[PDB]
Amino acid sequence: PEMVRGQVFDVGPRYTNLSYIGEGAYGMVCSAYDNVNKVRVAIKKISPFEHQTYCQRTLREIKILLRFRHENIIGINDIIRAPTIEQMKDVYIVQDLMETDLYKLLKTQHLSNDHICYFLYQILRGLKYIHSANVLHRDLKPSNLLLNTTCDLKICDFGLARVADPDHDHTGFLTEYVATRWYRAPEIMLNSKGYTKSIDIWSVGCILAEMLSNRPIFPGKHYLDQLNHILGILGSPSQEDLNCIINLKARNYLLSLPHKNKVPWNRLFPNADSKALDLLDKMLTFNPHKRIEVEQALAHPYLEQYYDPSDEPIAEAPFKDLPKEKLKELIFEETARFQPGY
């Protein structure tokens, strides 16, 4: 069995000539030569079975990626695992090799307005599909937007995804949250569990801002700091927006802050296309009920050269506490289609 950094990475005989990429979110990633399709691919080794949280996230990711089929969403090409539950200790997920990601690109490359426009279009087209499936991604950020050498953009990492549940979105002030801090919507810190589509649009708006300047717009260092970054640019919420926040601790926190005026986008982003900044404003709207929706964003004048709703498909099959032993069996079942025979 082939080794990579002295750990087993046994994908053969189909996958050979391995090169290390990284130590992943949790699990090692290599490129490898696919000897069937005659192209290099990406492979991630996952070893989740001792922990119910890792079983849950792995199962969730696999079920979603296998159900989805869209040019702006990473697909699963193959899944390698043992023929029996008892022998199954790792799972290998095979994807198209994506040479970079928006995180890497932003650390080194100035993006043209044409690239920003194209990347935003692709993000929203993929997101239209995800949301049409009643799914929230909940961890959109540059490193979760993969790109290949022709700049095809594919959303990945559905580990924190959920079925949308607006009727159970409410919670109290300072309720703990798991998704990446810099791309969290203001309401997460105030009164939201992140079970509405508007959570994802905020993250997209953060990404657009980042594309414009190569720097995160709201780099908070700790839970409440993230909200305070947001308010520093958007300015104090209006009375009407505060009236929407019934929770007293959340509303009173916002009323305790000194009045702060809006920082105009065109001062933050003096080289930006004016239509890009109009769309940015609408995605980075404090009130989630007033925030633009994905399909509305696609129809925005900024994207008019790409907008084509007939070429922006929706999902055919929208989605509607298990011990790790049951989750292992479900992962075994979910990966069965890739085993030799059919």
From Swiss-Prot:
Modified residues (Phosphotyrosine): Y177
Subcellular location: Cytoplasm, Cytoskeleton, Spindle; Nucleus; Cytoplasm, Cytoskeleton, Microtubule organizing center, Centrosome; Cytoplasm
Residue numbers carrying Phosphothreonine: T175, T180
Cited Pfam families: Pkinase
SUPFAM superfamilies in alphabetical order: Protein kinase-like (PK-like)
Function, in words: Serine/threonine kinase which acts as an essential component of the MAP kinase signal transduction pathway. MAPK1/ERK2 and MAPK3/ERK1 are the 2 MAPKs which play an important role in the MAPK/ERK cascade. They participate also in a signaling cascade initiated by activated KIT and KITLG/SCF. Depending on the cellular context, the MAPK/ERK cascade mediates diverse biological functions such as cell growth, adhesion, survival and differentiation through the regulation of transcription, translation, cytoskeletal rearrangements. Acts as a transcriptional repressor. Binds to a [GC]AAA[GC] consensus sequence. Repress the expression of interferon gamma-induced genes. Seems to bind to the promoter of CCL5, DMP1, IFIH1, IFITM1, IRF7, IRF9, LAMP3, OAS1, OAS2, OAS3 and STAT1. Transcriptional activity is independent of kinase activity.
Entry-linked PANTHER family: MITOGEN-ACTIVATED PROTEIN KINASE
Protein's UniProt name: Mitogen-activated protein kinase 1
Biological source species: Homo sapiens
Lineage per the UniProt record: Eukaryota, Metazoa, Chordata, Craniata, Vertebrata
Name of encoding gene: MAPK1
